[PDB]
Amino acid sequence: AKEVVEVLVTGGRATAGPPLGPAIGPLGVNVMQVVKEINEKTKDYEGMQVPVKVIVDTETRKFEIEVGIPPTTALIKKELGIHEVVGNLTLEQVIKIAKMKKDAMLSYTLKNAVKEVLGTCGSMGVTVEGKDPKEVQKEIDAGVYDEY
Ligand SMILES: [Cl-]
Structure with a gap:
């Protein structure tokens, strides 16, 4: 089977609690790898609500991650700094x-x-x-x- 999971995580601070754990642990793939890869690819969105898509082949357990973008609001704040x-x-x-x-x-x-x-x-x-x-x-x- 294939399962696509679409969730909203905190950029660069994804954990293996919920919602990644509930959604992914079942599909029996290493939740920590998923969490590592997601934190990698959301580095630039530290602390922002980022939509993420995980695509898993349950038989094989292989997955891939596709990251959305945060709200424009959040991108602007970031660009304004301090x-x-x-x-x-x-x-x-x-x-x-x-x-x-x-x-x-x-x-x-x-x-x-x-x-x-x-x-x-x-x-x-x-x-x-x-x-x-x-x-x-x-x-x-x-x-x-x-x-x-
Ligand atoms: Cl939808």
């Missing part, structure tokens, strides 16, 4: 946009996609619920909502 508010969105609006992203690209978990929307809002100086989107992300990252 604080103003200009609009606000509700969290339900954030979920709306995140649902469109995920419909169009199923490799996104709703969590992933909210993450990215939150990230883009930061990059635009837009608060979510009057709050800083890094703030609001922590609230989510703890496990505190599932009710919006």
